[PDB]
Design a protein around this nucleic acid. Sequence first.
DNA 1: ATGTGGTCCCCACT
DNA 2: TAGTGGGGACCACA
Lengths: 83, 58
Amino acid sequence: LKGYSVGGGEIVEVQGGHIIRATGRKDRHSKVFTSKGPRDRRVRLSAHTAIQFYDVQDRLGYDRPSKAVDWLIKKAKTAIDKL
Amino acid sequence: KDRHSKVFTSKGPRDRRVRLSAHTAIQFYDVQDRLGYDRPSKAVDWLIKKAKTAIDKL
DNA sequence: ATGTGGTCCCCACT
DNA sequence: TAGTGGGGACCACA
């Protein structure tokens, strides 16, 4: 809700949430703010999970995995809305 | 040298990491945190399970 | 002995 | 030249 930074990168309001600008120049990726604080946008999937996830991505025909995550979240909307 | 395993896919071996766009990450972590999971991988497990009906129509 | 999660740099591209 | 996706390496650990 309020704050320029956690105390930390500059906090920037976006649609539905907030991003955090990189704190340096060797790596300029933005992070995101979440209920548990700043988080990296990159995640490591376990082998079992990765295999299933890329099967979904490949069957969708999507080049970028993030778009397949978008699709999954849409298709799960019913279950998400119940927590 | 790194010792992380890759996984077999229809397009060849693939690294197990995914970079999420900012908007996707914000929505994804909302799901993960509302589920109470410490590891993101467990959240996409759950998304795949709950999207099964749609996945089977692919 | 060979993996793990998570992240730090870095390269090419915009 | 500011932010991107994704490769390779590294820390700490088992």
